[PDB]
Amino acid sequence: DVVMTQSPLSLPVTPGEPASISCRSSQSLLHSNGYNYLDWYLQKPGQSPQLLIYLGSNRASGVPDRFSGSGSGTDFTLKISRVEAEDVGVYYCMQSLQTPRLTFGPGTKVDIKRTVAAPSVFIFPPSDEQLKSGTASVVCLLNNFYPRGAKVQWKVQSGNSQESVTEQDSKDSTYSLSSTLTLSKADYEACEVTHQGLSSPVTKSF
């Protein structure tokens, strides 16, 4: 069988604050040598991943001592002592026991932590010259929302929507979503979100 490795896949962490990311290992990764066989990887957005912690606890050279590590036979814990404006990216809980290593895992969205905001649902009907150009793209824009746990519906249903969610800026530390509903000629003649920034769906149409 394949050992299922799963971490809390989201860690809103704020600068100057200690966090702790754990991991599931369905089987036992504590090998007979007395050393765990799990790796901690960090893919820096726009840069290559980095080796943080090998053998479960041993940190690599070059990376700061911030990434401290430990764990039990199955349960693991990377004790990030502290996070800065640089410490924001994707952390991979990779088991290195049964090669091949095809799956690196979904990865943990580590985000600058801040209180919950109100997503700005902005419905935007497509331009008419696009409608005479041969296509139609109505966009339900979401701006200044965090965390990013909402998808945009397209009713009156869905299935033609693609996602163009941006990354996290620095001084505002929010997310922006682009639900592009590519459409055809005749079918031109509403969007809502279920973000935790609100409770009731907000229904606004073109």
């Binding site: 790796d39 095809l102 935007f124 163009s164 941006t166 922006s176």
Partner: protein
């Protein structure tokens, strides 16, 4: 010190061959087993394969999705690791990586943006965003490949600017949606470097 700089990016169609070289400098090349990693844009990594050290000998193990398609070789005297792409297809559009170990990917190459798309190089269909009554934007649909910069007021407005990432359609083209959020009559310009299709746009509700 150690560097694993790569080379071999480009734009191809499904069904042709591509080159990927891993330059090795600073270490004994024959000690570590060279591995190759593929990163789908904006989402999860997928591992391709590795070659064992010639001291180990061993074999060349690959991922289940690249059996009979990709092969990996190595050499010490000239110190280059090879990822050979043959019979490429759509999924191969991703940034590949060169990792320093079959089980311990301790190092990580900068990444070569390997793109396998069926589109051709042409200007974008810049389509605006009439505000409902608010924010003002302008879609940049139907463009290829992916160098792109979209500014507002011709690089004068920078607060509230959200350059949305590339949008992968089934036709092999791209779409960008740069929108500003400010109450008001704004200028958005898209510059496609390969084609020299420089489009300026005025937007009203």
């Amino acid at each position: 010190e150690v560097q694993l700089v790569q080379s071999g990016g480009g734009l191809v169609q499904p069904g042709r061959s591509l080159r990927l070289s891993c330059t090795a400098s600073g270490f004994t090349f024959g000690d570590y087993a060279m591995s190759w990693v593929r990163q789908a844009p904006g989402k999860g990594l997928e591992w391709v394969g590795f070659i064992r050290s010639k001291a180990y000998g061993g074999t060349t193990e690959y991922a289940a999705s690249v059996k009979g398609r990709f092969t990996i070789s190595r050499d010490d005297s000239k110190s280059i690791a090879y990822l050979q792409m043959n019979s490429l297809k759509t999924e191969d559009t991703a940034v590949y990586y060169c990792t320093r170990g079959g089980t311990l990917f301790d190092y990580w190459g900068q990444g070569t943006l390997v793109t396998v798309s069926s589109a051709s190089t042409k200007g974008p269909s810049v389509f605006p965003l009439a505000p409902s009554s608010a924010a003002l934007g302008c879609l940049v649909k139907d463009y290829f490949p992916e160098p792109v910069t979209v500014s507002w007021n011709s690089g004068a407005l920078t607060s509230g600017v959200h350059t949305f990432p590339a949008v992968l359609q089934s036709s092999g083209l791209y779409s960008l949606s740069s929108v500003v959020t400010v109450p008001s009559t704004y200028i958005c310009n898209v510059n496609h470097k390969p084609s020299n299709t420089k489009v300026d746009k005025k937007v009203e509700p």
